[PDB]
Amino acid sequence: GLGGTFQKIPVALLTTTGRKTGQPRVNPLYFLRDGGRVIVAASKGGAEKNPMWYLNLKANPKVQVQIKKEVLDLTARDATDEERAEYWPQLVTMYPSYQDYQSWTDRTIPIVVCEP
């Protein structure tokens, strides 16, 4: 039950710009890569809705993603509903800690597409 992670769980470091500060903030997140896109997500919503990184990128879509030692400059947007339903099962399959197949239906769980 290692899913798709083998012996190393993949995590991306997302840098967003503070919506009040205009200074960078970094957050480790699970992700998928889909061609040139990087999809990032949180696994919890409800009390954890609207984390700072998400609010930052809603205000300013320019982000950086570091995966291993690769650094990408990307632009972020919400996954559309179709994309939520398409990518969430892939995240469930990849990561053993993502277990609820239907959590994509809860809009308080952010799912963000970062593209070039």
Coordinates of N, CA, C and O in Angstrom, one line a residue:
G1 N 0.8 -1.2 0.0 CA 0.0 0.0 0.0 C 0.8 1.3 0.0 O 0.6 2.2 0.8
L2 N 1.9 1.3 -0.9 CA 2.8 2.5 -1.1 C 2.2 3.3 -2.2 O 2.9 4.4 -2.5
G3 N 1.1 2.9 -2.8 CA 0.6 3.6 -3.9 C 1.6 3.8 -5.0 O 2.2 2.9 -5.5
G4 N 1.8 5.1 -5.4 CA 2.7 5.4 -6.5 C 4.1 6.0 -6.0 O 4.9 6.4 -6.9
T5 N 4.3 5.9 -4.7 CA 5.4 6.7 -4.1 C 6.7 5.9 -3.9 O 7.8 6.5 -3.6
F6 N 6.7 4.6 -4.2 CA 7.8 3.8 -4.0 C 8.4 4.1 -2.7 O 7.8 4.2 -1.6
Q7 N 9.8 4.4 -2.6 CA 10.4 4.6 -1.3 C 10.6 6.0 -1.0 O 11.3 6.4 0.0
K8 N 10.0 6.9 -1.8 CA 10.1 8.4 -1.6 C 8.8 9.0 -1.9 O 8.4 9.1 -3.1
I9 N 8.2 9.6 -0.9 CA 6.9 10.3 -1.1 C 7.2 11.7 -1.7 O 7.9 12.5 -1.2
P10 N 6.6 11.9 -2.9 CA 6.9 13.2 -3.5 C 6.2 14.4 -2.9 O 5.0 14.3 -2.7
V11 N 7.0 15.5 -2.7 CA 6.4 16.7 -2.1 C 7.0 17.9 -2.9 O 8.2 17.8 -3.2
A12 N 6.2 18.8 -3.2 CA 6.6 20.1 -4.0 C 6.6 21.2 -3.0 O 5.8 21.3 -2.1
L13 N 7.6 22.2 -3.2 CA 7.5 23.4 -2.4 C 7.0 24.5 -3.2 O 7.6 24.9 -4.2
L14 N 5.8 25.0 -2.8 CA 5.1 26.0 -3.5 C 5.4 27.4 -2.9 O 5.2 27.6 -1.7
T15 N 6.0 28.3 -3.6 CA 6.2 29.6 -3.1 C 5.1 30.6 -3.8 O 5.0 30.6 -5.0
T16 N 4.4 31.3 -2.9 CA 3.3 32.2 -3.3 C 3.8 33.6 -2.7 O 4.7 33.7 -1.9
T17 N 3.1 34.7 -3.2 CA 3.4 36.0 -2.7 C 2.3 36.4 -1.7 O 1.1 36.3 -2.1
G18 N 2.7 36.9 -0.6 CA 1.8 37.4 0.4 C 0.8 38.4 -0.1 O 1.2 39.5 -0.7
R19 N -0.5 38.2 0.0 CA -1.5 39.1 -0.5 C -1.5 40.4 0.3 O -2.0 41.4 -0.2
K20 N -0.9 40.4 1.5 CA -0.9 41.6 2.3 C 0.6 42.2 2.3 O 0.8 43.4 2.4
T21 N 1.5 41.3 2.2 CA 2.9 41.7 2.4 C 3.7 41.9 1.2 O 4.8 42.6 1.2
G22 N 3.3 41.3 0.1 CA 4.1 41.1 -1.1 C 5.4 40.5 -1.0 O 6.3 40.7 -1.8
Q23 N 5.6 39.6 0.1 CA 6.8 38.8 0.3 C 6.5 37.3 0.2 O 5.4 36.9 0.4
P24 N 7.5 36.6 -0.2 CA 7.2 35.2 -0.5 C 6.9 34.4 0.7 O 7.3 34.7 1.9
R25 N 6.1 33.3 0.5 CA 5.8 32.3 1.6 C 6.0 31.0 1.0 O 5.6 30.8 -0.2
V26 N 6.5 30.0 1.7 CA 6.6 28.6 1.1 C 5.8 27.6 1.8 O 5.6 27.7 3.0
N27 N 5.3 26.6 1.1 CA 4.4 25.5 1.7 C 4.7 24.2 0.9 O 4.6 24.1 -0.3
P28 N 5.1 23.2 1.7 CA 5.2 21.8 1.1 C 3.8 21.2 0.8 O 2.9 21.3 1.7
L29 N 3.6 20.7 -0.4 CA 2.3 20.2 -0.8 C 2.4 18.9 -1.6 O 3.4 18.8 -2.3
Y30 N 1.4 18.0 -1.5 CA 1.5 16.9 -2.4 C 1.0 17.4 -3.8 O 0.4 18.5 -4.0
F31 N 1.4 16.7 -4.9 CA 1.1 17.2 -6.2 C 1.1 16.1 -7.3 O 1.4 14.9 -7.0
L32 N 0.6 16.4 -8.5 CA 0.7 15.5 -9.6 C 1.4 16.3 -10.7 O 1.2 17.5 -10.8
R33 N 2.1 15.7 -11.6 CA 2.6 16.4 -12.8 C 1.8 15.8 -13.9 O 1.7 14.6 -14.1
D34 N 1.3 16.7 -14.7 CA 0.5 16.4 -15.9 C 1.0 17.1 -17.1 O 0.6 18.2 -17.4
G35 N 2.0 16.6 -17.7 CA 2.7 17.3 -18.8 C 3.4 18.4 -18.2 O 4.3 18.2 -17.3
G36 N 3.1 19.6 -18.6 CA 3.7 20.8 -18.1 C 3.0 21.4 -16.9 O 3.5 22.4 -16.3
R37 N 1.9 20.8 -16.5 CA 1.1 21.3 -15.4 C 1.7 20.7 -14.1 O 2.1 19.6 -14.1
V38 N 1.5 21.4 -13.1 CA 1.7 20.8 -11.8 C 0.4 21.1 -11.0 O 0.0 22.2 -10.9
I39 N -0.3 20.0 -10.6 CA -1.5 20.2 -9.8 C -1.1 20.0 -8.3 O -0.6 19.0 -7.9
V40 N -1.5 21.0 -7.5 CA -1.2 20.9 -6.1 C -2.5 20.9 -5.3 O -3.5 21.3 -5.8
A41 N -2.5 20.2 -4.1 CA -3.7 20.1 -3.3 C -3.4 20.0 -1.9 O -2.3 19.7 -1.5
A42 N -4.4 20.3 -1.1 CA -4.4 20.0 0.4 C -5.2 18.8 0.5 O -6.1 18.5 -0.3
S43 N -5.1 18.0 1.6 CA -6.0 16.9 1.8 C -7.2 17.2 2.7 O -8.2 16.4 2.8
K44 N -7.2 18.3 3.4 CA -8.2 18.6 4.4 C -8.9 19.9 4.1 O -8.3 20.8 3.6
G45 N -10.2 19.9 4.4 CA -10.9 21.2 4.2 C -11.6 21.5 5.5 O -11.0 21.3 6.5
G46 N -12.8 21.9 5.5 CA -13.5 22.2 6.7 C -12.8 23.3 7.5 O -12.6 24.4 7.1
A47 N -12.4 22.9 8.7 CA -11.7 23.9 9.6 C -10.4 24.4 9.0 O -9.9 25.5 9.2
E48 N -9.8 23.6 8.1 CA -8.5 24.0 7.4 C -8.7 24.7 6.1 O -7.8 24.9 5.3
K49 N -10.0 25.1 5.7 CA -10.2 25.8 4.5 C -9.4 27.1 4.3 O -9.1 27.7 5.4
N50 N -9.3 27.6 3.1 CA -8.6 28.8 2.8 C -7.2 29.0 3.5 O -7.0 29.9 4.3
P51 N -6.3 28.0 3.3 CA -5.0 28.2 3.9 C -4.3 29.4 3.2 O -4.8 29.8 2.1
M52 N -3.3 30.0 3.8 CA -2.7 31.2 3.3 C -2.2 31.1 1.9 O -2.3 32.0 1.1
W53 N -1.5 30.0 1.6 CA -1.0 29.8 0.2 C -2.1 30.0 -0.8 O -1.8 30.4 -1.9
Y54 N -3.3 29.4 -0.5 CA -4.4 29.4 -1.4 C -4.9 30.8 -1.6 O -5.1 31.3 -2.7
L55 N -5.1 31.5 -0.5 CA -5.5 32.9 -0.6 C -4.5 33.7 -1.4 O -4.9 34.7 -2.1
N56 N -3.2 33.5 -1.1 CA -2.2 34.2 -1.8 C -2.3 34.0 -3.3 O -2.3 35.0 -4.1
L57 N -2.5 32.8 -3.8 CA -2.5 32.6 -5.2 C -3.8 33.0 -5.9 O -3.8 33.2 -7.0
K58 N -4.9 33.1 -5.1 CA -6.1 33.6 -5.6 C -5.9 35.1 -5.9 O -6.5 35.6 -6.9
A59 N -5.1 35.8 -5.1 CA -4.9 37.3 -5.3 C -3.8 37.5 -6.3 O -3.8 38.6 -6.9
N60 N -2.8 36.6 -6.4 CA -1.7 36.8 -7.3 C -1.3 35.4 -7.8 O -0.6 34.6 -7.1
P61 N -1.6 35.1 -9.1 CA -1.4 33.8 -9.6 C 0.0 33.4 -9.9 O 0.3 32.2 -10.1
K62 N 1.0 34.3 -9.8 CA 2.4 33.9 -10.0 C 3.0 33.2 -8.9 O 3.0 33.6 -7.8
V63 N 3.5 31.9 -9.2 CA 4.0 31.1 -8.2 C 5.3 30.5 -8.6 O 5.7 30.5 -9.8
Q64 N 6.1 29.9 -7.7 CA 7.2 29.1 -8.0 C 7.0 27.7 -7.4 O 6.4 27.6 -6.3
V65 N 7.4 26.7 -8.1 CA 7.3 25.3 -7.5 C 8.7 24.7 -7.6 O 9.3 24.8 -8.7
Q66 N 9.1 24.2 -6.5 CA 10.4 23.5 -6.4 C 10.1 22.0 -6.2 O 9.4 21.6 -5.3
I67 N 10.6 21.1 -7.1 CA 10.4 19.7 -7.0 C 11.8 19.1 -7.0 O 12.5 19.3 -8.1
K68 N 12.2 18.5 -6.0 CA 13.6 18.1 -5.9 C 14.5 19.4 -5.9 O 14.3 20.3 -5.2
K69 N 15.4 19.4 -6.9 CA 16.1 20.7 -7.1 C 15.8 21.5 -8.4 O 16.4 22.5 -8.7
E70 N 14.7 21.1 -9.1 CA 14.1 21.8 -10.2 C 13.2 22.9 -9.7 O 12.4 22.7 -8.8
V71 N 13.4 24.1 -10.3 CA 12.6 25.3 -9.9 C 11.8 25.7 -11.1 O 12.4 26.0 -12.1
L72 N 10.5 25.8 -11.0 CA 9.6 26.2 -12.1 C 8.9 27.5 -11.8 O 8.3 27.6 -10.7
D73 N 8.7 28.4 -12.8 CA 7.9 29.5 -12.6 C 6.6 29.3 -13.3 O 6.6 28.9 -14.5
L74 N 5.5 29.3 -12.6 CA 4.2 29.0 -13.2 C 3.1 29.9 -12.8 O 3.3 30.8 -12.0
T75 N 1.9 29.8 -13.4 CA 0.8 30.6 -13.1 C -0.3 29.7 -12.6 O -0.6 28.7 -13.2
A76 N -0.9 30.1 -11.4 CA -1.9 29.2 -10.7 C -3.3 29.6 -10.9 O -3.6 30.8 -11.0
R77 N -4.2 28.6 -11.0 CA -5.7 28.9 -11.0 C -6.4 27.7 -10.3 O -5.8 26.6 -10.2
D78 N -7.6 28.0 -9.9 CA -8.4 26.8 -9.4 C -8.6 25.8 -10.6 O -8.9 26.1 -11.7
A79 N -8.5 24.5 -10.2 CA -9.0 23.4 -11.0 C -10.5 23.7 -11.2 O -11.2 24.0 -10.2
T80 N -10.9 23.5 -12.5 CA -12.4 23.5 -12.8 C -13.0 22.3 -12.1 O -12.3 21.4 -11.8
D81 N -14.4 22.3 -12.0 CA -15.0 21.0 -11.5 C -14.6 19.8 -12.3 O -14.4 18.7 -11.7
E82 N -14.6 19.9 -13.6 CA -14.2 18.7 -14.4 C -12.8 18.3 -14.0 O -12.5 17.1 -13.8
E83 N -11.8 19.2 -13.9 CA -10.5 18.9 -13.5 C -10.4 18.4 -12.1 O -9.6 17.5 -11.8
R84 N -11.2 18.9 -11.1 CA -11.2 18.3 -9.8 C -11.5 16.8 -9.8 O -10.9 16.0 -9.2
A85 N -12.5 16.5 -10.6 CA -13.0 15.1 -10.7 C -12.0 14.2 -11.4 O -12.0 13.0 -11.2
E86 N -11.3 14.8 -12.3 CA -10.3 14.1 -13.1 C -9.0 13.8 -12.3 O -8.4 12.7 -12.3
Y87 N -8.5 14.8 -11.6 CA -7.2 14.7 -10.9 C -7.3 14.1 -9.5 O -6.3 13.6 -9.0
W88 N -8.4 14.4 -8.8 CA -8.5 13.8 -7.4 C -8.3 12.3 -7.4 O -7.6 11.8 -6.5
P89 N -9.0 11.6 -8.2 CA -8.7 10.1 -8.2 C -7.2 9.8 -8.4 O -6.8 8.8 -7.8
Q90 N -6.5 10.6 -9.2 CA -5.1 10.3 -9.4 C -4.3 10.6 -8.2 O -3.3 9.8 -7.9
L91 N -4.7 11.6 -7.4 CA -4.0 11.9 -6.2 C -4.3 10.8 -5.1 O -3.4 10.3 -4.4
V92 N -5.5 10.3 -5.1 CA -5.9 9.2 -4.2 C -5.1 7.9 -4.5 O -4.5 7.3 -3.6
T93 N -4.9 7.7 -5.8 CA -4.1 6.5 -6.2 C -2.6 6.6 -5.9 O -2.0 5.7 -5.4
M94 N -2.1 7.8 -6.2 CA -0.7 8.1 -5.9 C -0.3 8.1 -4.4 O 0.8 7.5 -4.1
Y95 N -1.1 8.7 -3.6 CA -0.7 8.9 -2.2 C -1.5 8.1 -1.2 O -2.7 8.2 -1.2
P96 N -0.8 7.3 -0.4 CA -1.5 6.5 0.6 C -2.3 7.4 1.6 O -3.3 6.9 2.1
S97 N -1.9 8.6 1.8 CA -2.6 9.4 2.8 C -3.9 10.0 2.2 O -4.8 10.4 2.9
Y98 N -4.0 10.0 0.9 CA -5.3 10.5 0.3 C -6.1 9.3 0.0 O -5.8 8.4 -0.8
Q99 N -7.2 9.1 0.8 CA -8.0 7.9 0.8 C -9.5 8.0 0.4 O -10.1 7.0 0.1
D100 N -10.0 9.3 0.5 CA -11.4 9.5 0.3 C -11.7 9.8 -1.2 O -11.3 10.9 -1.6
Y101 N -12.3 8.9 -2.0 CA -12.4 9.1 -3.4 C -13.2 10.3 -3.8 O -13.1 10.8 -4.8
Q102 N -14.1 10.7 -2.9 CA -15.0 11.8 -3.2 C -14.8 13.1 -2.6 O -15.5 14.1 -2.8
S103 N -13.6 13.3 -2.0 CA -13.4 14.6 -1.3 C -13.3 15.7 -2.3 O -13.4 16.9 -1.9
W104 N -13.1 15.4 -3.6 CA -13.1 16.5 -4.6 C -14.4 17.3 -4.6 O -14.4 18.4 -5.0
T105 N -15.5 16.6 -4.1 CA -16.8 17.3 -4.1 C -16.8 18.4 -3.1 O -17.7 19.2 -3.1
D106 N -15.9 18.4 -2.1 CA -15.9 19.4 -1.1 C -15.0 20.6 -1.5 O -13.8 20.6 -1.5
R107 N -15.7 21.7 -1.8 CA -14.9 22.9 -2.4 C -14.0 23.5 -1.4 O -13.1 24.3 -1.7
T108 N -14.1 23.2 -0.1 CA -13.2 23.7 0.9 C -11.8 23.0 0.8 O -10.8 23.5 1.4
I109 N -11.6 22.0 0.0 CA -10.3 21.4 -0.3 C -9.8 22.0 -1.5 O -10.3 21.9 -2.6
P110 N -8.7 22.8 -1.4 CA -8.2 23.4 -2.6 C -7.5 22.5 -3.5 O -6.7 21.6 -3.0
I111 N -7.7 22.6 -4.8 CA -7.1 21.8 -5.9 C -6.7 22.9 -6.9 O -7.6 23.5 -7.5
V112 N -5.4 23.1 -7.2 CA -4.9 24.2 -8.0 C -4.1 23.7 -9.1 O -3.3 22.8 -8.9
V113 N -4.3 24.2 -10.3 CA -3.5 23.9 -11.5 C -2.5 25.0 -11.7 O -2.9 26.2 -11.9
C114 N -1.2 24.6 -11.8 CA -0.1 25.6 -12.0 C 0.4 25.3 -13.4 O 0.8 24.2 -13.7
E115 N 0.4 26.3 -14.3 CA 0.9 26.0 -15.7 C 1.8 27.0 -16.1 O 1.9 28.1 -15.6
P116 N 2.6 26.7 -17.2 CA 3.6 27.6 -17.6 C 3.1 28.9 -18.2 O 2.0 29.0 -18.6

